Design a protein around this ligand. Structure first.
Ligand SMILES: Nc1ncnc2c1ncn2[C@@H]1O[C@H](COP(=O)(O)OP(=O)(O)O)[C@@H](O)[C@H]1O
Lengths: 743, 115
């Protein structure tokens, strides 16, 4: 509602020298006509020039040659703040040099060829950094800044000397413009970017407030994540969007020097950041400079680690210098860096998901023309283990597959380079399929922490169980005050036990989906890997991760695997304890009820698991997952058949009652077998049809009425004979005996 | 668009100054294997060779070997023209000479045995 808060809209004068007006807004302003008005947009850039060639349109908005959306702004929604600052000095001459196209074609003198018909009573009332379209020709070439006789913006006059003998190109400013990446260039990290924004915006943008009072700035931010996840890009985007100076340092160029020169370069780099404050220093691949102390072997390799620590502590006086680093894991560097005054804030970039992958695909394919049948949603679903760069490669490779496959000989000598071939060309789905299928070895094998997609409706029954899950998990986060009022401490564990294939792995995902929390799944094979490898420290790395992504759910299944390996329940030797559950208990006990971390366990042999895990605390609630009932069986059948064309004479209700004791796994196998029969019949019919008319002396015969559009009753009848029960009544009797003896 | 120019590709025949082309583009240029045909190439050099009609090579592509491409100063992907030369002659004595150091450390009347 600020009186000088107004939007900007379209423009019609192509000489951006014009600055608009709005009489309703002018009356509130003191805007004068003449050379210059000091206007203000975003990220400290500006564009000042002659004014008031407007009022053709309505009011409440400002007009300006659309170039001010790329320079000084990005897009609609911004708000001009135009306050005049007229009667500015007139230097000798103001940075006469174009950049992009003036090299292509007749270059001449670059002054007396194209621009001379512009400054005629409008002698370049212009700011340094302004860029606009000006030509004596096609009418579109940019303009930039090299010379600066006076420091601030000025106006030129005749009888002045120009220095345009320089060559157009990407200037330091032009490289800086691409470098002016912004937040649009990043996608798939919504939380981490906000966390960084809240962390550094106040110190860099508003130093004065921090000067007045006593608050601690962010001394060190350590971003750890796998390679190719856009970290230096994030640093550049954040630095530019706040207008702070950005300095880059790399490890290899510091360890590829002679002994003293590396320290000298580090000192010079630190000095070159305190004279441009507020500024940011970014160091990438820190693992190359400061590795683990034991790993570090030699003398000069420690003289470069102590120097860095000393330099870090010389910043308590100055709260306007910030340092951000990048590594893979935090335990790959000396802990001395992790302290209270050197590197106290940590961020995990992590991995993107279907949404983030789709956003990255959209950004990468902005200028890549895709004619049709490019959903980009199925691509995100089929890319499991891809990070950043990989997708970019994908985008390129498919594009190459578009031209290489058929344009191999067309573009050799028939024509020179032309755009009618490049733009007329498109990219199809088969190119993406070939790229993704053929030459995409994913570079990820790390665990994933992300919300799943399974909903409650995917589970046939267990109505009572879901109520208990809600009570246990959602209420403490939903209503903490009620829990505290009654002097109550909520539980933090639950154990599932039941026969195999009854739907225990799905609940852990459905609960997280309902509660909107991340989930982590750990299998039995990993526990055996730790047992044989005798590496129990990894357990810590698990729990730490769970603490970083709070709120979250931690899932362990096949807990009985280790007790199974060493003999039966009696075992070849020893008791019910081992070297891997002891560590799990140690981590569990040393964990606060806060941070909303829930733990779930699953097994089918509760008699052999360690009793210590069932004590008060740890996992004290036990739930029995039974075989589904006939109604549950019809429900599972509908859930499994919800994604296939199976309209049939037979009725799933008929199938369910015939089943007796069938587990959930058995009901997901009948459908697969029936569909296998249907697809085999379809393929046989297609091959015979395609073969008959051509092998026969019949040139052209067309008929494609789908012989197998759906799964008819016959396929299910065949499949029913091939499927039986997969359990015995003795297992059910054992489970019932345990469910009864617990009393 | 001028089905006279044509693009390069590898070759199978080991004989020198020999080629092969797809079967359909034998009437398009209207000339058969025995037809001795001249081919153009950069630095303004054109070399005549025997011809043949094969199948594997695509209509847009020719087959030849380094022996000829070298003197033609042409590489793969490049493109050339072509013209039949039934006017060729039963040449008489046409002088030759070994051009290399390959002759280094050799003896015997190479002329006969080799040529
Ligand atoms: N209530 C259910 N609803 C839908 N599918 C189920 C259900 N119970 C079991 N399943 C099927 O069983 C499989 C999962 O088995 P799971 O319960 O993880 O075995 P275990 O209990 O040995 O871990 C899934 O593929 C799923 O199709």
């Amino acid at each position: 509602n600020r009186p000088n808060r107004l939007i900007v809209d379209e423009a019609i004068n192509e000489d951006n020298s014009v600055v608009s007006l709005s009489q309703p807004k002018m009356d509130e302003l003191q805007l004068f006509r003449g050379d210059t008005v000091l206007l203000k947009g975003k990220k400290r850039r500006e564009a000042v020039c002659i004014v008031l060639s407007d009022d053709t349109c309505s009011d409440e908005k400002i007009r300006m040659n659309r170039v001010v959306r790329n320079n000084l702004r990005v897009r609609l929604g911004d708000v001009i703040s135009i306050q005049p600052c007229p009667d500015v000095k007139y230097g000798k001459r103001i940075h006469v040099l174009p950049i992009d196209d003036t090299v292509e074609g007749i270059t001449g003198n670059l002054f007396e060829v194209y621009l001379k018909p512009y400054f005629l009573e409008a002698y370049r009332p212009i700011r340094k950094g302004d860029i606009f379209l000006v030509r004596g020709g096609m009418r579109a070439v940019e303009f930039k800044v090299v010379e600066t006789d006076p420091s601030p913006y000025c106006i030129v006059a005749p009888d002045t000397v120009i220095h345009c003998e320089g060559e157009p190109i990407k200037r330091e400013d032009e490289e800086e413009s691409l470098n002016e990446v912004g937040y649009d260039d990043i996608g798939g990290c919504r939380k981490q970017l906000a966390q960084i924004k809240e962390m550094v915006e106040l110190p860099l943008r508003h130093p004065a407030l921090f000067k007045a009072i006593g608050v601690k700035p962010p001394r060190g931010i350590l971003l750890y994540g796998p390679p190719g996840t856009g970290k230096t890009l994030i640093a550049r985007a954040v630095a530019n969007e706040t207008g702070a100076f950005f300095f880059l340092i790399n490890g290899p160029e510091i360890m590829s020097k002679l002994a003293g020169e590396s320290e000298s370069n580090l000192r010079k780099a630190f000095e070159e950041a305190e004279k441009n404050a507020p500024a940011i220093i970014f160091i990438d691949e820190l693992d190359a400079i400061a590795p683990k102390r034991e790993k570090t072997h030699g003398e000069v390799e420690r003289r470069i680690v102590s120097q860095l620590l000393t330099l870090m502590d010389g910043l308590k006086q100055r709260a306007h210098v910030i340092v951000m680093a990048a590594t893979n894991r935090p335990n790959s560097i000396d802990p001395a860096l992790r302290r209270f005054g050197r590197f106290d804030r940590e961020v995990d970039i992590g991995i993107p998901d279907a949404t983030g992958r789709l956003e990255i695909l959209q950004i990468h394919t902005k200028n890549m023309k895709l004619a049709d049948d490019v959903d980009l949603e199925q691509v995100a679903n089929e890319t499991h283990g891809h990070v950043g760069a990989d997708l970019a490669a994908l985008c390129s490779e498919a594009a190459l597959q578009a031209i290489r496959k058929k344009m191999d000989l067309i573009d050799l000598e028939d024509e020179t380079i032309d755009a009618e071939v490049m733009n007329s060309l498109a990219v199809t789905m088969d190119d993406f399929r070939w790229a993704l299928s053929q030459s995409n070895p994913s570079a990820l094998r790390e665990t994933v922490v992300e919300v799943p997609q399974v909903t409650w409706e995917d589970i046939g029954g267990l109505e009572d169980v879901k109520r208990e899950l809600q009570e246990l998990v959602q209420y403490p986060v939903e209503h903490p005050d009620k829990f505290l009022k009654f002097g109550m401490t909520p539980s933090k564990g639950v154990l599932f036990y039941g026969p195999p294939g009854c739907g225990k792995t799905l609940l852990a995902k459905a609960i997280a989906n309902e509660c909107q929390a991340n989930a982590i799944s750990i299998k039995g094979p990993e526990l055996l890997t730790m047992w044989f490898g005798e590496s129990e420290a990894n357990v810590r790395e698990i729990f730490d991760k769970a603490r970083q992504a709070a709120p979250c759910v931690l899932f362990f299944d096949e807990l009985d695997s280790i007790a199974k390996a060493r003999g039966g329940n009696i075992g070849d030797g020893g008791g019910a304890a081992d070297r891997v559950i002891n560590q799990i208990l140690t981590e569990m006990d040393g964990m606060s009820t806060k941070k909303n971390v829930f733990i779930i366990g699953a097994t089918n042999r509760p008699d052999i698991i360690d009793p210590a895990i069932l004590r008060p605390g740890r996992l004290d609630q036990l739930i029995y997952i039974p075989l589904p009932d006939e109604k549950s069986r019809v429900a599972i059948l509908k859930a499994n058949l919800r994604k296939s064309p199976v309209a049939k004479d037979v009725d799933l209700e008929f199938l369910a009652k015939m089943t007796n004791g069938f587990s959930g796994a058995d009901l997901t196998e009948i459908c697969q077998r029936a569909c296998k029969l249907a697809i085999r019949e379809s393929i046989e019919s297609e091959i015979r049809r395609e073969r008959e008319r051509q092998t026969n002396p019949s040139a052209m015969e067309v008929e494609e009425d789908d012989p197998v559009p759906e799964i008819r009753r016959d396929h299910f009848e065949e499949a029913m004979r091939f499927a039986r029960r997969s359990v015995s009544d003795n297992d059910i009797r054992k489970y019932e005996m345990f469910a009864q003896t617990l009393q």
